[PDB]
Amino acid sequence: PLIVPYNLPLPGGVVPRMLITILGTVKPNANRIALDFQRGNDVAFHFNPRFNENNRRVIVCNTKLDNNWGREERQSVFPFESGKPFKIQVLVEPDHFKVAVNDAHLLQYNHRVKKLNEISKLGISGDIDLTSASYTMI
Ligand SMILES: CO[C@@H]1[C@@H](n2cc(-c3ccc(Cl)c(F)c3F)nn2)[C@@H](O)[C@@H](CO)O[C@@H]1Cc1cc(C2(C)COC2)no1
């Protein structure tokens, strides 16, 4: 393992056909996980599984601009389980990030931040044991 929080540099930012893979295990009494694709202080793409928001499991996605959170996009499809190994795959496409978990499509998130080549860090945090974080071009 690596110990969270972990920052993965994305040198020169991201580009369509770039596949980011995050392997780890959800901790047994997990409350939250976050991935933060950052352009400086802005968060181009925040991907935030919540295990107990009002006693429901929900995925919240958003963007932070000038330290202000925007409109949330929410999904009840929730593929994570406390205590289990996971794989998150974020595929950069021309108009969106595509997310699959454990080889099943989960969601798309339209690019609000347009300068993909300045989204130069991925922060990984929350209630996981982190096994690896890496990228390849498909
Ligand atoms: C309470 O702050 C959350 C955010 N958040 C989470 C974390 C975080 C930290 C550490 C770990 Cl380890 C982790 F896993 C984490 F997720 N940091 N920040 C973020 O999720 C955000 C997503 O919109 O919503 C909350 C903040 C929020 C929303 C709104 C609205 C007005 C509702 O519609 C927009 N305003 O403020």
From Swiss-Prot:
Chain positions found as Phosphoserine: S76
Keyword ATP-binding recorded: no
GO biological process annotation, one example: negative regulation of T cell activation via T cell receptor contact with antigen bound to MHC molecule on antigen presenting cell
UniProt motif Nuclear export signal: location: 114-129
Annotated keywords: Acetylation, Cytoplasm, Differentiation, Disulfide bond, IgE-binding protein, Immunity, Innate immunity, Lectin, mRNA processing, mRNA splicing, Nucleus, Phosphoprotein, Repeat, Secreted, Spliceosome
Span of domain Galectin: 6-136
Compartments reported by the entry: Cytoplasm; Nucleus; Secreted
Subunit structure: Probably forms homo- or heterodimers. Interacts with DMBT1. Interacts with CD6 and ALCAM. Forms a complex with the ITGA3, ITGB1 and CSPG4. Interacts with LGALS3BP, LYPD3, ZFTRAF1 and UACA. Interacts with TRIM16; this interaction mediates autophagy of damage endomembranes. Interacts with cargo receptor TMED10; the interaction mediates the translocation from the cytoplasm into the ERGIC (endoplasmic reticulum-Golgi intermediate compartment) and thereby secretion.
Protein name per its UniProtKB record: Galectin-3
